[PDB]
UniProtKB/Swiss-Prot annotation, chain A:
Protein name: Phosphoprotein
Residues recorded as bearing Phosphoserine in the entry: S40
Gene name of this polypeptide: P/V/I
Origin organism lineage: Viruses, Riboviria, Orthornavirae, Negarnaviricota, Haploviricotina
Top-level taxon of origin: Viruses
Boundaries of the shown chain within the full protein: 218 to 286 of 391
Binding partners and assembly: Homotetramer. Interacts (via multimerization domain) with polymerase L; this interaction forms the polymerase L-P complex. Interacts (via N-terminus) with N0 (via Ncore); this interaction allows P to chaperon N0 to avoid N polymerization before encapsidation. Interacts (via C-terminus) with N-RNA template; this interaction positions the polymerase on the template for both transcription and replication. Interacts with host RPS6KB1 kinase; this interaction may play a role in the viral replication and transcription.
Role this protein plays: Essential cofactor of the RNA polymerase L that plays a central role in the transcription and replication by forming the polymerase complex with RNA polymerase L and recruiting L to the genomic N-RNA template for RNA synthesis. Also plays a central role in the encapsidation of nascent RNA chains by forming the encapsidation complex with the nucleocapsid protein N (N-P complex). Acts as a chaperone for newly synthesized free N protein, so-called N0, allowing encapsidation of nascent RNA chains during replication.
Domain notes: The N-terminus consists of a long intrinsically disordered tail. The central part contains the coiled-coil multimerization domain (MD or OD). Forms a four-stranded coiled coil structure. The C-terminus constitutes the alpha-helical X domain (XD) that binds to the nucleocapsid (N-RNA complex) and the L polymerase.
Family: Belongs to the rubulavirus/avulavirus P protein family.
Length: 69, 58, 60
């Protein structure tokens, strides 16, 4: 009779910390955002470096270069 | 009498499971975000690999 | 009563569905491993780049 109710509260309790463990992982995401915002800056600075090196390579009079189209 | 309290606790169980469902769906969404960051960072890596070469010739 | 236990047969069926779905959520392990590998690679390759930049020669 009452044993089943006892184990029932036990289940409620178990699930209650299921929430906690999950609450933690949901909160683990902000780190991601910042990382996306900072990788945007990584993208733009890497593109700047790429364009600068392309300009350098195309600045050698030794090898004539042609603009596409 | 007890069956009424049991009804309430089991209904609360259902609600708790719905909460877990939503939170884990948000976890799937975060996973979609991390996969986007994956492909984009891979593109970043490939671009950096492409530039290391000119480093010497120039 | 009986109605409640039928509601829990439905609700824990939803529970098996929940665990089935989070089985897919488990997949990001090797995923984060891969992203760690790529960025570490990025770090190593930019190491070479900064290494060759500091030099006495002037670019021609």
């Amino acid at each position: 009779a009452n044993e089943i109710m006892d184990l029932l509260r036990g289940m409620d309790a178990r699930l209650q910390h299921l929430e906690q463990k999950v609450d933690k992982v949901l909160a683990q995401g902000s780190m991601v955002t910042q990382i996306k915002n900072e990788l945007s800056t990584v993208k733009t600075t890497l593109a700047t470096i790429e364009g600068m090196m392309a300009t350098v390579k195309i600045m050698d009079p030794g090898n004539p270069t042609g603009v596409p189209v």
